Amino acid sequence: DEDETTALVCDNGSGLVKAGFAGDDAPRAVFPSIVGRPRHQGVMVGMGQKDSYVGDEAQSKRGILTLKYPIEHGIITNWDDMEKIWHHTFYNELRVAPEEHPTLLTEAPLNPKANREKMTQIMFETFNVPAMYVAIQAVLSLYASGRTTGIVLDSGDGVTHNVPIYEGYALPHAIMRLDLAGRDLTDYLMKILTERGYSFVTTAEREIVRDIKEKLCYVALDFENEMATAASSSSLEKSYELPDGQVITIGNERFRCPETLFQPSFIGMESAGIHETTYNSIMKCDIDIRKDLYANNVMSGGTTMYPGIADRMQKEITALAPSTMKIKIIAPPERKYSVWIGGSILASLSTFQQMWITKQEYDEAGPSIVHRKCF
Amino acid sequence: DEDETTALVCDNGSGLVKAGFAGDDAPRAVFPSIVGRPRHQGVMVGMGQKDSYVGDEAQSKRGILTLKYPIEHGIITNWDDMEKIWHHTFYNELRVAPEEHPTLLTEAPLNPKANREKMTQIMFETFNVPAMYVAIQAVLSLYASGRTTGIVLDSGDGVTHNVPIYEGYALPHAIMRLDLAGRDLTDYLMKILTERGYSFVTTAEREIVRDIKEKLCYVALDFENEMATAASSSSLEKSYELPDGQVITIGNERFRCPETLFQPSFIGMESAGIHETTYNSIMKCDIDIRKDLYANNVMSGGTTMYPGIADRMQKEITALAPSTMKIKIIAPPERKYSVWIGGSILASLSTFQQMWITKQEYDEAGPSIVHRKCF
Amino acid sequence: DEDETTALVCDNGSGLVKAGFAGDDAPRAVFPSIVGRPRHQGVMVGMGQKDSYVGDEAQSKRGILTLKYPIEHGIITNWDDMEKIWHHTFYNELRVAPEEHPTLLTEAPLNPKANREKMTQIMFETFNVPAMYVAIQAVLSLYASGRTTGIVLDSGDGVTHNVPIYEGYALPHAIMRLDLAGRDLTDYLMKILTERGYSFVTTAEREIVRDIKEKLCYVALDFENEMATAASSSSLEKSYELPDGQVITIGNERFRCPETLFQPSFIGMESAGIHETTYNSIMKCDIDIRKDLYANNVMSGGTTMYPGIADRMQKEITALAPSTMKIKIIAPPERKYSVWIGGSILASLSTFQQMWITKQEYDEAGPSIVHRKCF
């Protein structure tokens, strides 16, 4: 752009599309990745602007809408709403043409084989797009922290991934992938809320469950001890008067939903927490590579934001690991935009030009350019 | 007697007071759950009978009273109502004391936690009943249908709940509690009858709504087919009469009220159907578990008592039935009384007694011991 | 038993306990060597029979169960479920008392020093058992095929062992032992399945991965050539509609998991296939002993069952071996019960009574009887 080549850097996901230009710090154009349709039909003369209320416009005027949620855990329910989702990004906020610039996205790691080629086709075959890459989340983060080796657990909304990384990259014997992440701890709140009285069952009230959660829940440090502390009215109970009008006293539900990360006994599955799936990934490596993965455990995404979390793992993760060390969680101050900032560097560094899919390469290769260049 | 002490059995959520002994066949009190409170008073030299009335005189001598639903969405509204009813119906209608004979109550499946406690309080603290169970409705219909494996969809007037029992019970992921039942059809009927003739507002016509709801309304053959036929008011429309002097013809809105159980299309807000909640129970179980669940779909409760249901669950559940196993319903003939028959059977057993709550499994133990005998 | 002494013969393993009496052809009492516990909790009144659902009863009613898997690669995860495993075998199927007869197991070769004693103690110190041996797998097979010399590669479920045998027995310089066997092929399938979409992550679905795999996967004859043949829909793709409901089109995964035996590039190790570890064992011998090992390569276990396998090695194993010969794989028609049939002969031949551990010999020697008689 202007004197230089430049580009756009993007982290999508299940929850938030976070768009920017390139060489930026952190995001500029950010919206939730959903389309919303009029559910509350009667008729119209005056109408609240839209056909498809999108992202930001959508999450704002919730109460006419069935929010059609797309990328639930990396898998998109049906693709059709997505092309409208990205029709926001470029031309509405950024005012660029995707037909001009390079586009960095993220691989939401272990998104299926065909979704690589389906996404590149939206861009190269439908919307032109001059070059693109889609960078595999958790490892970007590492470098922006100033780490080489470590075990990175990176989870925003959709999927939970423990990634052992070193001076060289990881491979699909060791690394793991669970459902039970940041949006599951959003949705999981309502399965519990029943025992006080409330279930925000339906679609606008669903988005309120996300919203209530993120602002004032916390993680239990040791749940079992804090369960008697549920008799202490002051630490727990606090008043969410909904600005529409209903008071959710979120009491125990504040930490009982966040515990589910470490405790899957609660939902009903044999997953161990992210503490134990961290051992699971670190053990199935070579024998020598380990020492330094223990020296720095990188913790990132919209999952690792909640109050009381790094501390937790600093107890937990000693119990059934190797013993001989300085074990140390490295969560950055803002640790959620891990993906984004680590990607920003790659998009700015003109040394990245060894790697990416350029316009013509797609037509030369066919749709299986993406697994001709990458994997 | 024999195995048990011999309790009273009461299914009495939002809809009807069904009460009798353990050992009785069909229940002996059978009238609505309605709490009568006099509004049309004026002055009196002598007034007709009670303070709080139950469905005895409140269905007979309607329009002087307010005909209050004591329970809405499975949850008990206030403590004039059921506090009186669960001594009254045993004292007056049956003629034994609950101080003498123990009490089996219905739990409208998954009320709040302290409602287990408070329904126990009515027995233990208020009257001093020597033992009781506030028991989860679908579990009664289950053992009336005699088995281990069954996906039990029990729809009362109060709530609907989908319980997948296998060769072992449901873990806390598999189940579904559903805010769509016969009470929603009560509020729905007074909503819809407007466009045909009859706008309904108060508690008096809320009883007349029940009267139309349970016998002239039904679920259609298919919605689309009976709707396409619905220019034919001669074929479709027939009268109920308000038993007093007012003719009520309904025909299209025969089905377009309980058809809400299959399609949420009618409502306003998206309370999901018996169809979707069958899937959200059957699918949310283990991966090797559905074969004999699909072969044993138990359809029960007050609100499933129609035609358009055992037949239609053989039809519509085929949409997400994969190529191997097929749908096979278990609908009892009287499936409103399957709850009651199951209660009579269960309250005749020592296994159910030891599972329930004794009067001194409370004071000394700590009252949420109720919520820790059952759930 | 009856007129004679007789005994029970018994291959165990990682996957299947295969029990019989003695002088039998092949097995009688056969079950998978696992204990299952109720993971799907809820409550009970009706219950699906068991505390510990075991082996056969376990693998049948999967969906309530956490299957607690014991002997993963010869090493048992914790022993406690094992004594219930063998409390099937004798009394439940066979009817016999282990307190009466001789017992012939297998050494799962290179099962650790103490596991020899620990196993004999379960039987001699806990369960009496009048005589026992535990025969070292791969060499039993040889004789039942009517071979003396050959290189035997036996692997069933747990471990992979290349065993050079001659007119006299092998020793621990030459013989080798890998992990990467029949059950690792089983489990490996899910760490690939992700590309298409599926990952049967959890415990009942884990057992389904074993089950799917064995019935319709195949081995690639030369994988690299067959990778273009992945475009041919008919040879590959085939419909596993799960009898619970979910279609696994196992396409490429059919052969890409079986290739891992020859190709460890695909998990992520250095291990050359069982082709090359065959050279590895055959080279580190004396100089003369070789000629005849090449004349008959014996190939056995639950590993060597899969369609296209002996043929494979008949290409492969010429490339980096000695050149001057009639090289020849001898896989028997049924080649999996190698261990069992070769053991059956030894149990029947009363000339075996120069070798075993008899009841009293244990108490005379202490727990180290097993290394006082054997190794």
Ligand SMILES: Nc1ncnc2c1ncn2[C@@H]1O[C@H](COP(=O)(O)OP(=O)(O)O)[C@@H](O)[C@H]1O
């Ligand atoms: N201030 C905040 N504190 C905690 N969580 C937050 C905050 N703001 C947003 N979130 C959470 O971040 C999540 C969205 O993560 P997302 O960035 O979409 O991850 P991804 O892009 O990788 O899918 C949601 O669960 C949301 O509630």
Ligand SMILES: Nc1ncnc2c1ncn2[C@@H]1O[C@H](COP(=O)(O)OP(=O)(O)O)[C@@H](O)[C@H]1O
């Ligand atoms: N033949 C029938 N078909 C459908 N509904 C019926 C029929 N007979 C009675 N009902 C209705 O069944 C409901 C009673 O169910 P009930 O078990 O009392 O509710 P709850 O489960 O809340 O206790 C009422 O709405 C009643 O009018």
Ligand SMILES: Nc1ncnc2c1ncn2[C@@H]1O[C@H](COP(=O)(O)OP(=O)(O)O)[C@@H](O)[C@H]1O
């Ligand atoms: N018909 C079959 N064809 C192929 N493999 C089979 C068949 N039946 C069972 N298996 C496989 O045999 C293996 C079990 O081997 P096992 O007999 O337990 O060896 P071991 O006793 O020495 O541990 C499993 O991988 C299972 O899938």
Ligand SMILES: [Ca+2]
């Ligand atoms: Ca992201």
Ligand SMILES: [Ca+2]
């Ligand atoms: Ca009821």
Ligand SMILES: [Ca+2]
């Ligand atoms: Ca074996």
